[PDB]
Amino acid sequence: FNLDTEELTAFRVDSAGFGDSVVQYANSWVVVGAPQKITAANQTGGLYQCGYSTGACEPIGLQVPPEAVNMSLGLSLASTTSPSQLLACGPTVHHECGRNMYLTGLCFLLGPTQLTQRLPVSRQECPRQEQDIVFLIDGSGSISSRNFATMMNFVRAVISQFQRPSTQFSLMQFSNKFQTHFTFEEFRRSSNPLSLLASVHQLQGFTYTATAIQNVVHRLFHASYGARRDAAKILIVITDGKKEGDSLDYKDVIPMADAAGIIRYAIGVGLAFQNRNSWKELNDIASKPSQEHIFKVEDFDALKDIQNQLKEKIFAIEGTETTSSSSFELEMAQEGFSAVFTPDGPVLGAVGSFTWSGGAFLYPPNMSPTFINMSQENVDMRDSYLGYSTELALWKGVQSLVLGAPRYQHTGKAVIFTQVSRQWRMKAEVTGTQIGSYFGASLCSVDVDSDGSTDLVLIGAPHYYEQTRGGQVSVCPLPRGWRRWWCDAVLYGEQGHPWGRFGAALTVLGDVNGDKLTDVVIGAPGEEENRGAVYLFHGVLGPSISPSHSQRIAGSQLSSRLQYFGQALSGGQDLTQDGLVDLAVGARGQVLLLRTRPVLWVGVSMQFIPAEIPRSAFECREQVVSEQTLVQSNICLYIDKRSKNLLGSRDLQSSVTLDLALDPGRLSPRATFQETKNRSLSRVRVLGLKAHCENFNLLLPSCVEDSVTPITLRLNFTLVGKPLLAFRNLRPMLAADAQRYFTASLPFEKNCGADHICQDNLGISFSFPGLKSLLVGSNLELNAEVMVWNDGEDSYGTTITFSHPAGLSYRYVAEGQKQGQLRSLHLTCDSAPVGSQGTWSTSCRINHLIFRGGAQITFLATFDVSPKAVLGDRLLLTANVSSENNTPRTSKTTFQLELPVKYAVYTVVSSHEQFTKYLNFSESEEKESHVAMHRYQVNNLGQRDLPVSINFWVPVELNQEAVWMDVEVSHPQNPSLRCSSEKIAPPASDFLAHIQKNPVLDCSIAGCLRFRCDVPSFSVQEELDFTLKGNLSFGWVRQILQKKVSVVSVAEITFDTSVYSQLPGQEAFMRAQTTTVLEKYK
Amino acid sequence: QECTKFKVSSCRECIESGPGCTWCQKLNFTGPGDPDSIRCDTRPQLLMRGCAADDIMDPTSLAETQEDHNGGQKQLSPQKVTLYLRPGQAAAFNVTFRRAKGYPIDLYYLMDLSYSMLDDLRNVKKLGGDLLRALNEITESGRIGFGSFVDKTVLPFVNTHPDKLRNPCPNKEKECQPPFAFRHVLKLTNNSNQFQTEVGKQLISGNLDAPEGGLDAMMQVAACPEEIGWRNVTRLLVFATDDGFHFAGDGKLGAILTPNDGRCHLEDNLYKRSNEFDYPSVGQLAHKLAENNIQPIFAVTSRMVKTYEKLTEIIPKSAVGELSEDSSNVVQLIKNAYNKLSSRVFLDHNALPDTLKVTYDSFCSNGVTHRNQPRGDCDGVQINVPITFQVKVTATECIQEQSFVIRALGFTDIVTVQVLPQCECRCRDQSRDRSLCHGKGFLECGICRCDTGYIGKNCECQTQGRSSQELEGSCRKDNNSIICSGLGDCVCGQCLCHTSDVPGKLIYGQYCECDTINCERYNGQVCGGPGRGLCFCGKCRCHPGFEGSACQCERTTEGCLNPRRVECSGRGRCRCNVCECHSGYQLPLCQECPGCPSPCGKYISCAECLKFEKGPFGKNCSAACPGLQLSNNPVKGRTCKERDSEGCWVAYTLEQQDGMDRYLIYVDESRECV
Ligand SMILES: *[C@@H]1O[C@H](CO)[C@@H](O[C@@H]2O[C@H](CO)[C@@H](O[C@@H]3O[C@H](CO[C@H]4O[C@H](CO)[C@@H](O)[C@H](O)[C@@H]4O)[C@@H](O)[C@H](O[C@H]4O[C@H](CO)[C@@H](O)[C@H](O)[C@@H]4O)[C@@H]3O)[C@H](O)[C@H]2NC(C)=O)[C@H](O)[C@H]1NC(C)=O
Ligand SMILES: *[C@@H]1O[C@H](CO)[C@@H](O[C@@H]2O[C@H](CO)[C@@H](O)[C@H](O)[C@H]2NC(C)=O)[C@H](O)[C@H]1NC(C)=O
Ligand SMILES: *[C@@H]1O[C@H](CO)[C@@H](O[C@@H]2O[C@H](CO)[C@@H](O)[C@H](O)[C@H]2NC(C)=O)[C@H](O)[C@H]1NC(C)=O
Ligand SMILES: *[C@@H]1O[C@H](CO)[C@@H](O)[C@H](O)[C@H]1NC(C)=O
Ligand SMILES: *[C@@H]1O[C@H](CO)[C@@H](O)[C@H](O)[C@H]1NC(C)=O
Ligand SMILES: *[C@@H]1O[C@H](CO)[C@@H](O)[C@H](O)[C@H]1NC(C)=O
Ligand SMILES: [Ca+2]
Ligand SMILES: [Ca+2]
Ligand SMILES: [Ca+2]
Ligand SMILES: [Ca+2]
Ligand SMILES: [Mg+2]
């Protein structure tokens, strides 16, 4: 609620797409992006650095390589603070690979160091296609010596049009025999391959078409001869006759060839082919379709007229199996489309990875970079732009990345990744809510508190709705314990204005109002009539945000004429060097900076020196005077919450206007101040972090009507002037919860008769109906049934105050429709901090009516208790009770009671599926060792570190007949812990019939073995897991005289029933089981 | 019935208290020293007190059905509803809708021209004489138009040089046309043969990225018929593509951050703006499209059938058509169009101001007895069988006279529903009895409202200096109560609650007992801030659509619903848009129980009883195996892999769904008896 909308800085540099993407640089500067700032030949854009000192933007020097074209840099930005560095990107680089160009991306790292240029600037060369063409030629005696040199001249010709090593050739000639003139190995090695072409001589002889074909693919197309393994296999043939004497047939050859995948062409000569007996050997020979892989001819000479045509059919080769689909890799991934840093090197995001799946390339410290896609075993995620947006997620442990996939199944999903030692797998994910919603656009890891461990994560979906298309941002905390994660710890902020594009961008802003609760900003350039807009929210406690925003600075703030503002924004850094953080929001044409005005708030204390009125100037009399009694009222003012503004100037001096007024609501002033003589007064006085107490003089007229109702005195107070030394504060202000209206009461000595002395006698007692054990997690509301007495004079403005630990406060009950032997009662309660360090009082005066005679009354007061309630292993609470006429005497009548407190914990255990259920028929003898393996995994989603002890139950002895021997428990991935061992004998019932019911072998039948594996401190989120194994004997199997028996092991986790418990009521997730089977017959 | 007293100064301030609030005008009804606020109770209480029946001013909500002549409008009546709406009280008016006949049709064929749509262009290039033939039965002289589309010109949606750009055609290069995105080939015309022959003309094209940019074409079509032309009756479109679809946000890839304006700007029946222009958002159609009475008919491959299926949920009037990759059964699409497109009767309204809340009812023809919900979704009504929607309009406060409309989505018939703020209760003026109220005040239905400076039930008292002994009688609720509950000084029997210049704060009541600040909080706001609800003497009167002690359970809606549209899946009541999943089922919609044993035992017996046929063991199956479904598809999630009845490791995933022990399996076509 403290975003300046008057005295701010504005940079309006008109450079096309300027102010389209912006980021906080090293605190002294702010960098803006102008992707469409045309430079040279359809090339880059350019960046601009701007300082606060002088309202002006200076161009930034850059060595734009001729390689990077139309990359329009600045589109994607990112900055770190560790050491200050910045990062810009051209996610539209164009490199011409001939037939078609693509998009690679190119970024730059600047700073107070070396101007690095990282992909890193291996100008991403085009893709190399591998082809292994094999010329096959008929050398039968039918061909003349003249038509030979002409054909081999056409061969060399079709060989030159190609370039190696991306292309390869191997020749064979086939008549009655088969000569391999040169192999694939003798082509890439021979500096002059065509030198071997004019070296071959004709064969004449017979003709065995099909025979050669097999002699070609089962030799020349071996990786042995040199034919590259991962290659495209092409085979061409040139013949002038059918196959006669051909001891083979196409019915055998064609199939196994297509297996390796070999496109087959054909070029004939004679026109005897255009008969219906010599036309089928072009179709059969070639691969389907037949009308594409053939180019018959009459003349060997004009065979080179189609030398011009064969150019194409071979180059157009891509892939023929799944009806010429369209696969990819990293040609149009526009890396750097979105980038974010992290302690272990920067991280740019690719989009067009493979099936446009997506991912992100990580760059370590001059170590070669890594990369994280989703694997291919992940069938889905086609066309989702995984990595459209990227953000960090630091934690007390290792880092965690997050990528936005706007179009997963065309709806939008967001996926979080972890980088475990030698793993780099997926943590979890969440689908979108609606189709086209675009769930994934924006993301921001933010910190509800300031513990440094990213608590939650925001998500964007500007194009979403159900009735109103305002937009949609989604709050999604970061649960630890993979395979479970919800973007629904409830909420999602919006607005009541369709077509607003709310969630287009957003950034952590941090602590601005100083209540230890980080606050975030969110853009929406579509609000109003295309006009811009921005929003401000606040955290609460842990994973949560406040739906109701405090501010909504939009494009109506004398932003004379900008169309859509808020496209992007980043804040959190102090750049104007006026103490507190700043915010930068980009807009079309210009970019603004909104500072945060210091918010201090103050505490107050009120009192009336003369506690009450002594009845002296009460009912009064009318011989002689008004001896107007003189009451003193002392008020004090002091400011305490400060942490951000720190000591020194401003955080101290600050004048204020005070406005005291007595019995305001009534047109019958019960008194007046002396200084001014009015029923109210004002005086401007200086405040400090040190209290300022001043008492004023009050004049009560001797005679007065109403005395029962105390006289009220409230103060209106603000912050006047706002001149403070330098103009380095300018404007301070107050917070949202500003109870600027504080009132204190002054009672009267009620006439309790012409005598009888007015004895104040009130007792009190309360309890907790049905309250069982009270653990922190369950039992959030705390129902207190307080009864109270009045064995003395009437108490009028009787008050009832409680003392309680910080971990709870009072909330109004407001129960009604018609129930009780109970509350009925309108009462006013005011919480407030009291004791030295921890406890504090919530007073509650029974507002507007009397408590008479020996009458008792009971009301209900409930205290919400926080899930993270810091309080001793016991919590006490008291109840002071007294009349409006204060406590005139000695021994207080307080009533207290102390309760045992426990704390919520979530503790679960599963039976990992690496479990040995191995039964099988080969059971000839009684052997020993096919050791079974019962792996148990455990983890706690609680919110506190707590010692535990994981118990086990493994069967062994069974009437002297061991079940499985030498059983121990391994504890990998974790220190060598200490585990206990103890044998025990079950009840000894008739086991014969027992397991006949159920083949199961629980510990109740066979002498089991308990393992007590203690644990020092089971830190939350710790998935501490371990397994147990032992050679499993087959001997005991006969002891019971059945088959298909199954032995079970039980594993139950435990912890001190006292102090800790489990939350939901009762979950047996702390008791897993693993049933192995020993079915072995014969 | 029900009536809690707000500040009651006149008969009108009694009406602004609630629906069940009545007022009595009968004079001499006030006792020796009784409150004037007593005149405002419930009708029953008034009669029990003595207040005559004809003295009970009771403005109730009702409806004015000014029906037209005929040919005013066709099957939406009434045509003009002039409601007189009292706040808090609902006015109900019915809506008869009996669709009559097929009006002039107007089709438009949005075909994606790709290399994958080759045999589509061949088996469709000219089959339109059977379209008018399929149009002949129901409708008469309709219209037929065509529009082509591919994807944005500039990359990364398709290589932008080089002269592959002049020749995108893969490998065949049969003189395909230049890469485009929207070419209006044919305008809406009567002829049919001229239409076919103008289509075959153009050949396909090609692009890079797999999904298409067909959405941009959508808007450009229904954007400016000042150049394309459109009939003033019906307008049906039909999407056709064996590819995906790009929406807003994807344009940022092509260095374009200029959103969609909504209007097309062509110069040669061909877009040249889509490049300097971003993609239409997903929701930018259900508005603009449904505004021009146009409705696409999804008809693509089975590979893209269930993706457009989720799209059917959002946008209104749209059907899904799975067809072969040859587009041969394309004309049967429209036999399935009118099938459930003439079926979706809609009944929404212009975005009303927040000061109003509208609902409807539904009485479909085949069986359905629906009640209380927006829209008018009755997918079981067609030609000549009327329907029934009960429109109930309620207000929160005394609105200002305004007017809105209730249209049927995809229909030009406008129903101008007038709305009148009915609150005031006429009775008399200050010509009758300038006497009582001792001249310094007027009279209104009995009581007298005094001037700024005169007060009392007969303007007899003045706002300075007064008080009596037992005038303090009805001035305190009971014998053991403080006068006027404090915060109020009693004058002439009754109390004048003091005033507080503090936001929200306000005292009121006979004995000044109630305030509008001391209620139950919520999110650090009184009764849920001014947005959600309000405060009145402790209890919160939450605005419409909000319930709870303090509007705590903020919404009466159910976001607890999934796409399945069953609350919280398996188990979990839907409280406050939150599910209470039984056992360890986790949020939000209660499907995954992470800690559960992921039980494959006891399932093997039934796995070989469904995929393989190795003997339903205990009995048969489909009885001991209510995991009824065994989709022939790669479902996944609970990747299980255990053994069979005799040796072999039978693999199979296990995708659970919704309630209790309901499942969906694909048992691998494989075994392992090693
Ligand atoms: C990141 O994401 C990718 C994709 O989502 C995961 O899966 C990769 O998917 C592609 C699918 O195309 C795999 O394909 C690779 O093709 C290369 C060349 O193209 C061949 O394949 C096409 C299709 O058959 C042919 O038509 C063409 O003629 C080629 O034969 C191969 O060279 C790749 O390498 C394979 O062989 C090489 C030989 O040098 C071996 O070194 C490799 O081990 C590998 O077997 C490959 O066949 C590709 O295999 C997939 N990548 C991986 C690592 O499996 C990736 O898994 C994922 N990346 C990581 C690191 O997780
Ligand atoms: C970059 O390319 C664009 C086109 O992609 C050029 O814009 C115009 O393009 C048309 C069509 O090719 C040409 O006929 C015009 O001559 C171009 N305009 C101008 C002013 O040259 C654009 O010129 C190119 N920019 C640069 C500087 O290379
Ligand atoms: C403290 O409170 C009073 C009342 O709010 C202020 O008096 C002004 O009174 C009028 C109504 O009569 C309000 O509309 C104004 O908002 C009040 N102040 C203004 C002008 O904003 C009084 O000024 C306050 N005391 C000071 C000076 O701090
Ligand atoms: C004196 O009293 C009047 C009425 O209460 C008030 O309006 C005025 O501000 C006061 N004047 C001073 C000087 O305090
Ligand atoms: C109630 O307890 C608080 C605790 O500090 C104390 O300040 C107050 O005086 C007590 N009230 C009385 C008068 O008993
Ligand atoms: C509307 O229709 C329903 C059901 O047919 C009927 O009960 C009700 O009386 C009708 N309402 C009006 C205002 O006629
Ligand atoms: Ca945090
Ligand atoms: Ca803060
Ligand atoms: Ca600053
Ligand atoms: Ca097709
Ligand atoms: Mg020959």
- 3-state SS string over A530-556? CCCEEEEEEECCCCCECCCCCECCECC
Beta strands at B298-300 and B320-322: parallel, antiparallel or unpaired = parallel
Cis before A710 (ω within 30): no
Indicate the domain borders of chain B: 1-67+427-466, 68-99+346-426, 100-345, 467-504, 505-674
Asked if residue A980 and residue A891 are part of one domain, the reply reads no
A226 within 8 A of A188, measured Cβ to Cβ: yes
Cis before B588 (ω within 30): yes
Q: Which residues, including other chains, have CB under 8 Å from residue B434's CB and lie 6 or more apart?
A: B442
**CA-based nearest distance B497→chain A, Å:** 8
A655 within 8 A of A721, measured Cβ to Cβ: yes
Helix (H) / strand (E) element for B195: namely helix B193-200
Domains B68-99+346-426 and B100-345 share a fold: no
Please name the residue whose Cα sits nearest to atom 13 of ligand 5. Answer: A887
Q: Which residues, including other chains, have CB under 8 Å from residue A632's CB and lie 6 or more apart?
A: A608, A609, A610, A695, A696, A697, A698
Cα–Cα distance for residue pair B45/B646, rounded to 1 Å: 81
Show residues of chain B in contact with A318, CB under 8 Å: 170-171
Mapped onto helix, strand or coil, the DSSP state of residue B287 is helix
Q: Which residues, including other chains, have CB under 8 Å from residue A677's CB and lie 6 or more apart?
A: none
A10 within 8 A of A565, measured Cβ to Cβ: no
Cα–Cα distance for residue pair B249/A501, rounded to 1 Å: 11
Cα–Cα distance for residue pair A319/A231, rounded to 1 Å: 11
Q: Which tokens is B521 given?
A: 């909080």
Q: Is B390 in the pocket of ligand 6 (CB under 6 A)?
A: yes
Asked if residue A1061 and residue A982 are part of one domain, the reply reads yes
> What CA–CA distances, in Å, run from A452 to A373, A455, A582, A943, A1022?
28, 9, 20, 17, 19
Of A598, A626, A646, the domain-final residue: A598
State which of B94, B392, B393 you would mutate to test the pocket of ligand 6, scoring each by most atoms of that ligand within 8 A of its C-beta.
Answer: B94
Strand order in the sheet with A413-418: A390-391, A400-405, A413-418, A426-430
Q: Measure A659 CA to ligand 3 centroid, in angstroms.
A: 9
Output helix, strand, coil percentages for chain B, rounded to the nearest 5. Answer: 15, 20, 65
Cα–Cα distance for residue pair A647/A253, rounded to 1 Å: 91
Q: Which residues, including other chains, have CB under 8 Å from residue A136's CB and lie 6 or more apart?
A: A171, A172, A173, A174, A212, A213, A216, A235, A236, A237, A238
Radius of gyration of chain A measured on its C-alpha atoms:
43
Nearest CA-CA partner of A470 in B584, B351, B239: B351
A1059 within 8 A of A873, measured Cβ to Cβ: yes
Beta strands at B143-149 and B183-189: parallel, antiparallel or unpaired = antiparallel
Show residues of chain A in contact with B601, CB under 8 Å: 1075
Nearest CA-CA partner of A714 in A749, A666, A757: A666
Nearest CA-CA partner of B224 in B263, B186, B182: B263
Mapped onto helix, strand or coil, the DSSP state of residue A260 is helix
Distance in Å from the first CA to the final CA of chain B: 80
Q: Which tokens is A937 given?
A: 């995994």
Helix A209-217 crosses helix A250-260 at what angle (to 10 degrees)? 30
Cis before B162 (ω within 30): yes
Please name the residue whose Cα sits nearest to atom 5 of ligand 2. Answer: A42
| Burial of B427 from C-beta contacts in 10 A (0-12 / 13-18 / 19+) | middle
Q: Which residues, including other chains, have CB under 8 Å from residue A278's CB and lie 6 or more apart?
A: A241, A242, A270, A272
Which residue, chain included where needed, has tokens 């999630």?
A: B637
B120 annotated as a binding-site residue = yes
Q: Measure A514 CA to ligand 8 centroid, in angstroms.
A: 4
Judge whether B194 is closer than 8 Å to chain A, CB to CB: no
Mapped onto helix, strand or coil, the DSSP state of residue B35 is coil
Of A277, A298, A325, the domain-final residue: A325
Alpha carbon dihedral A290, A294, A299, A304, in 10-degree steps, equals 170
Asked if residue A141 and residue A77 are part of one domain, the reply reads no
**Amino acid residing at A72:** S
Cis before B503 (ω within 30): no
**Amino acid residing at A102:** Y
| Burial of A937 from C-beta contacts in 10 A (0-12 / 13-18 / 19+) | middle
CATH number at residue A333: 2.130.10.130
Beta strands in B441-522 (DSSP E): 441-443, 448-450, 454-455, 461-462, 488-491, 494-497, 507-508, 514-515, 521-522
**What are the backbone angles phi and psi of residue A327, rounded to the nearest 5°?**
-95, 170
**CA-based nearest distance A436→chain B, Å:** 5
Which of B74-83 are b and which e, b meaning 16 or more Cβ less than 10 Å from the residue's Cβ?
bbbbbbbbbb
Helix (H) / strand (E) element for A661: namely strand A654-662
Asked if residue A584 and residue A645 are part of one domain, the reply reads no
Cα–Cα distance for residue pair A1037/A961, rounded to 1 Å: 9
Secondary structure of B101-121 as H, E, C letters: CCCCCEEEEEEECCCCCHHHH
A428 within 8 A of A377, measured Cβ to Cβ: no
Show residues of chain A in contact with B520, CB under 8 Å: 811-814
Asked if residue A942 and residue A1044 are part of one domain, the reply reads yes
Please name the residue whose Cα sits nearest to atom 48 of ligand 1. Answer: A376
Cα–Cα distance for residue pair B466/B495, rounded to 1 Å: 12
Mapped onto helix, strand or coil, the DSSP state of residue B468 is coil
Question: Ligand 3 pocket: which residues have CB below 6 Å?
Answer: A 657, 659, 716, 718; B 501
Q: Which CATH superfamily is domain B100-345 in?
A: von Willebrand factor, type A domain (3.40.50.410)
Give the nearest ligand 4 atom to A679 CA: 5
Cα–Cα distance for residue pair B1/B19, rounded to 1 Å: 9
Asked if residue A1033 and residue A948 are part of one domain, the reply reads yes
Of A754, A788, A803, the domain-final residue: A754
Cis before A343 (ω within 30): no
Alpha carbon dihedral B470, B476, B482, B488, in 10-degree steps, equals -100
Nearest CA-CA partner of B323 in B334, B314, B312, B339: B334
**CA-based nearest distance A172→chain B, Å:** 28
Q: What is the CATH number of domain B68-99+346-426?
A: 2.60.40.1510
* Sign, CA torsion A204/A206/A210/A215: negative
Q: What is the resolution of this structure in A?
A: 3.5
Largest CA distance in chain B: 112
Q: Helices H, strands E: what count in chain B?
A: 12, 30
- Which experiment gave this structure? X-ray
Instruction: Work out how many domains chain A is built from and give that number.
Output: 5
> What CA–CA distances, in Å, run from A141 to A241, A243, A279, A674?
11, 13, 21, 136
Cα–Cα distance for residue pair A93/A928, rounded to 1 Å: 66
B173, B254, B634 ranked by CB distance to A379: nearest: B634
Q: Do A708 and B531 touch (CB under 8 A)?
A: no
User: Which residues share a beta bridge with B385?
Assistant: none
Beta strands at B236-240 and B106-112: parallel, antiparallel or unpaired = parallel
Nearest CA-CA partner of A397 in A411, A418, A383: A418
Asked if residue A428 and residue A574 are part of one domain, the reply reads yes
Asked if residue A395 and residue A543 are part of one domain, the reply reads yes
Domain that holds residue A702: 599-754
Distance of CA A26 to the CA centre of its chain: 25
Mapped onto helix, strand or coil, the DSSP state of residue B606 is helix
Nearest CA-CA partner of B97 in B83, B78, B70: B78
Asked if residue A836 and residue A719 are part of one domain, the reply reads no
User: Which residues share a beta bridge with B421?
Assistant: B85
Asked if residue A544 and residue A396 are part of one domain, the reply reads yes
Cα–Cα distance for residue pair A819/A1076, rounded to 1 Å: 58
Mapped onto helix, strand or coil, the DSSP state of residue A1058 is coil
Nearest CA-CA partner of A563 in A640, A647, A501, A628: A501
Cα–Cα distance for residue pair B448/B25, rounded to 1 Å: 11
Q: Which tokens is B248 given?
A: 């807003």
Which of A196-213 are b and which e, b meaning 16 or more Cβ less than 10 Å from the residue's Cβ?
bbeebebbeebbbbbbbb
Which residue, chain included where needed, has tokens 């910080």?
A: A806
**What are the backbone angles phi and psi of residue A712, rounded to the nearest 5°?**
-85, 150
**What are the backbone angles phi and psi of residue A193, rounded to the nearest 5°?**
-65, -45
A435, A469, A705 ranked by CB distance to B310: nearest: A435
**What are the backbone angles phi and psi of residue A151, rounded to the nearest 5°?**
-80, -45
Please name the residue whose Cα sits nearest to atom 10 of ligand 4. Answer: A678
Q: Is A679 in the pocket of ligand 4 (CB under 6 A)?
A: yes
Nearest CA-CA partner of A217 in A271, A160, A285: A285
Asked if residue A150 and residue A79 are part of one domain, the reply reads no
B349 within 8 A of B407, measured Cβ to Cβ: yes
Show residues of chain A in contact with B485, CB under 8 Å: 847-849
B644 annotated as a binding-site residue = no
Q: Measure A687 CA to ligand 9 centroid, in angstroms.
A: 24
Asked if residue A865 and residue A988 are part of one domain, the reply reads no
Q: Is A678 in the pocket of ligand 4 (CB under 6 A)?
A: yes
Strand order in the sheet with A565-571: A9-11, A591-595, A582-587, A565-571
Name all contacts of A326-330 with Cβ < 8 Å and 24+ positions apart: A326/B208, A326/B210, A327/A354, A327/A355, A328/A352, A328/A353, A328/A354, A328/A355, A328/A356, A329/A127, A329/A353, A329/A354, A330/A104, A330/A124, A330/A354
CB pairs under 8 A between A and B: 224
State which of A658, A716, A718, A734 you would mutate to test the pocket of ligand 3, scoring each by most atoms of that ligand within 8 A of its C-beta.
Answer: A716
